[PDB]
Ligand binder design. Structure first.
Ligand SMILES: *[B-](O)(O)CNC(=O)c1ccccc1[N+](=O)[O-]
Ligand SMILES: *[B-](O)(O)CNC(=O)c1ccccc1[N+](=O)[O-]
Ligand SMILES: [Cl-]
Ligand SMILES: [Cl-]
Ligand SMILES: [Cl-]
Ligand SMILES: [Cl-]
Ligand SMILES: [Cl-]
Ligand SMILES: [Cl-]
Ligand SMILES: [Cl-]
Ligand SMILES: [Cl-]
Ligand SMILES: [Cl-]
Ligand SMILES: [Cl-]
Ligand SMILES: [Cl-]
Ligand SMILES: [Cl-]
Ligand SMILES: [Cl-]
Ligand SMILES: [Cl-]
Ligand SMILES: [Cl-]
Ligand SMILES: [Cl-]
Ligand SMILES: [Cl-]
Ligand SMILES: [Cl-]
Ligand SMILES: [Cl-]
Ligand SMILES: [Cl-]
Ligand SMILES: [Cl-]
Ligand code: NA
Ligand code: NA
Lengths: 467, 467
């Protein structure tokens, strides 16, 4: 008889979400093993009838064989996550109908998936929202595709200034954020805390202009994005991801820039000990350690500021000692409020969370800010109660390679003379330390100091800076 | 033997905070009774030696007599409040040393005090911070002394506009709020949610200019304020109150405008049944029902907006069914962050809370916003767990007498022609319903539409309104 086991070898089942998810993945690994065993070439494998035969064969091989499939699942943790969604999932319901949910808890150092939530209740809806369903990651794209890459390329530092002035998509329509057409210049911190859209748009346009291999970064984390030539890319337009895959991007940032491929199956053995399949770690330095650790600091204040999520308040009340762990994270919201995300990490773990409706109709305006935050606070509490040391008490910290520059708070660049139609002008004023991931740190203030901005924009900004 | 009892007649003690507080008040009532019994005149009562004699006599009378002193205290509730501060008071400590605390829970319909917190731990510090210590109520003054009176006098409605532009105290110093010297025009809702200072300053100046009997309102609620001629009065300057007294002001607003005097002793009887003392209700309509119910709606969004307090997030996580009760409230913060307040009500109850240091040194910047909010969320949860129906599920609602006007969102006044140096101008634009407590509702827009503002201010505002 074949068995699926938890990571400690305790049997899950002989051959709900846990069962079908782990069995499905194991059948895929058995497929690969059986095709290679029978000497089926890649070309023969392209044949649809051969594929169907080998997929059925892999299913039956497990049913009838005596294979031992070792999963990465932690029994206590995954059980506590099921209880949490059963008891607390109703907190998601926001008057837009029954709200669905997916979560994945991942070991930052290995990519192992310790536990997950596939949905509100398998018996009523079997769609697996942790592993199968793909939805836009919305503004949780921004740290990975826009800001993180710009920092890694030395095009941006932690206190760099960006334009949030009103600007239009190429087609003439305003770039919106809730009901605002934008404001003025702002720091990266403020752009991220609030999740403004315009600054991310200009950052991705700056990457394009510098011919940065953005696809290179993303594919190193296993993202598949069919088209990079999309204005709204850094806000999640043109991207659709599973919670498991997206959790892996945030694993990369939390793990000081080093990607480990997500997995739920670690090994499959025949009864006699032959290894059919074994996971093989292939670590990749996707962002420099400087860049990742700079981003950690920014995503810490995303949660602390409480601007787009109540999570820290919710978790402080439920478990104040766990709230004092070093949480960092980012929210995501789609344009019609169709998908909400909250991605959380401590140095040890990352927990991804999505909520939404299976038919894509809109959630309430505050579903991500309050409901999903409160739910994920209960879920994080449940995980900790079931495994008290799992989140860990380590702090994220700036890598020694980070370059620290003194820059004007107004310009996010080093003080000095600047040309402002006429008066070549001594740029003075209060300063701040800005973190960079290049060799030389911040440049001298230049007239076009911000990421993005129109001529009129700069005239207004500099006007303001003068007095 | 004399006994002090809970409201249901269960004995507290024969003759911690509960004991000393109730005994002290009972000794004061016995003093009054014994002086009147012995036919001591008011003039003889002014004699310091006679007073000392009669206070000692009242103490001994209780010690030796067989009096039954009935308190308003609810045993389960008050016990749960003690357990809460014992278990959760450490959540107040914010790195400025040991933080003290006072709370009073009051029945809105009667003024009865059902329970209270006198401090972190009687055995270590006996100061009674619920009944005895007096501190500035800071910005929790604003609803009572400024906005509530202005509304009640028909000088303001729920969507009235106020100046938050920079302005100075008479002595030249800027009126500050945290580190801001002010912004621009704003609605009453936004002034209250954020607790801006300048708008409250101008509202109290407008009351002065209209010769409003502000002292009349305040003394009807039992406040003693020695000097009304203070610019910072509506921000709590020149006022010092006990938590018990201040809870009574918020009781008045919650009780649709009707004050009931706070009390902890309801009756004292000799052993043979003679009534030495009995509380006598003397209800007073301090604000019209219109005004109070308009204020309830505004203080509901103070908590909902979560701008100056995380309370709603904290309580949603601890007890989401109780968080769905109809909470309204207001925070207070002193200038050096010396005192933080959070006043909470449902239609049934009000709970006052102060925290601070006995020597008045500063708390952390977020002590009121986060620490005291989280603590009071646990305290409200503890009260409900001990008496499940005590907070009640009733909603606050606008009294039928409220006048509803359609007013410009920009002016907070009715649309129409206005004089703006030159072009007599048709004032158009998006509108909103504003609530008033007078007969005629909102006036027609006039040039000086806002509460307060300088000439330059209005030129800027109208400039902006034009385009
Ligand atoms: B974020 O706070 O969720 C903001 N993101 C968006 O507005 C977004 C979401 C998904 C696709 C596109 C898009 N756009 O800025 O256009
Ligand atoms: B409120 O949000 O606490 C603002 N209040 C104050 O600034 C205040 C507190 C106490 C006394 C005076 C004062 N002033 O505005 O000057
Ligand atoms: Cl499951
Ligand atoms: Cl568009
Ligand atoms: Cl690319
Ligand atoms: Cl993908
Ligand atoms: Cl491209
Ligand atoms: Cl896998
Ligand atoms: Cl075998
Ligand atoms: Cl925090
Ligand atoms: Cl919050
Ligand atoms: Cl420098
Ligand atoms: Cl460099
Ligand atoms: Cl006590
Ligand atoms: Cl002053
Ligand atoms: Cl007066
Ligand atoms: Cl007083
Ligand atoms: Cl006066
Ligand atoms: Cl009393
Ligand atoms: Cl008697
Ligand atoms: Cl709320
Ligand atoms: Cl009207
Ligand atoms: Cl009138
Ligand atoms: Na967001
Ligand atoms: Na305040």
């Amino acid at each position: 008889i074949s068995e699926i086991t938890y990571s400690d070898g305790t049997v899950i089942a002989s051959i709900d979400y846990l069962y079908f998810t782990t069995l499905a993945e194991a059948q895929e690994r058995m497929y690969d093993y059986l095709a290679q065993r029978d000497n089926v070439s890649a070309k023969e494998l392209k044949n649809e009838a051969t594929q169907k035969f080998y997929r059925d064969l892999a299913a039956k091989e497990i049913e009838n064989g005596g294979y031992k499939i070792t999963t990465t699942i932690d029994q206590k943790i995954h059980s506590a996550m099921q209880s949490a969604v059963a008891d607390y999932g109703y907190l998601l319901d926001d008057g837009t109908g029954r709200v669905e949910v997916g979560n994945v808890l991942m070991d930052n150092q290995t990519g192992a998936i310790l536990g997950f939530v596939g949905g509100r209740n398998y018996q009523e809806n079997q769609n697996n929202h942790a592993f199968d369903t793909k939805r836009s990651p919305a503004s949780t794209t921004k740290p990975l595709l826009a800001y993180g890459i710009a920092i890694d390329q030395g095009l941006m530092g932690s206190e760099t200034i960006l334009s949030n002035y009103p600007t239009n998509f190429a087609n003439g329509n305003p770039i919106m954020y809730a009901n605002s057409k934008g404001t003025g210049m702002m720091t990266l911190g403020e752009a991220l805390n609030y999740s403004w859209n315009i600054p991310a748009y200009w950052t991705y346009r700056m990457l394009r202009e510098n011919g940065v291999d953005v696809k290179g970064y993303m594919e190193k984390m296993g993202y598949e994005i069919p088209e990079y030539g999309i204005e709204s890319l850094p806000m999640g337009g043109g991207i659709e991801v599973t919670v498991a895959q997206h959790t892996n991007g945030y694993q990369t940032l939390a793990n000081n820039g080093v990607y480990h491929q997500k997995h739920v199956i670690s090994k499959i053995e025949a009864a006699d000990g032959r290894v059919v399949y074994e996971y093989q770690d292939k670590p990749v330095q996707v962002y420099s350690k400087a860049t990742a650790t700079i981003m950690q600091g920014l995503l810490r204040e995303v949660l602390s500021s409480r601007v787009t999520t109540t999570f820290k308040s919710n978790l402080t009340s439920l478990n104040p000692t766990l709230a004092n762990a070093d949480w960092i994270g980012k929210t995501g919201t789609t344009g019609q409020d169709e998908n909400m995300w909250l991605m959380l990490s401590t140095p040890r773990l990352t927990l991804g969370g999505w909520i939404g409706h299976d038919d894509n109709h809109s959630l309430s305006q505050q579903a991500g800010y309050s409901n999903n935050s409160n739910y994920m606070a209960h879920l994080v509490n449940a995980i900790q109660q079931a495994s008290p040391s799992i989140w860990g008490n380590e702090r994220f910290a700036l890598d020694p390679s980070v370059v620290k520059s003194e820059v004007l708070k107004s310009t996010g660049q080093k003080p000095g003379k600047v040309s402002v139609e006429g008066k070549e002008v001594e740029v003075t004023g209060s300063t701040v330390t800005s973190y960079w991931a290049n060799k030389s740190g911040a440049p001298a203030t230049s007239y076009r100091f911000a990421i993005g901005g129109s001529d009129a924009d700069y005239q207004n900004a500099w006007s303001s800076i003068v007095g």
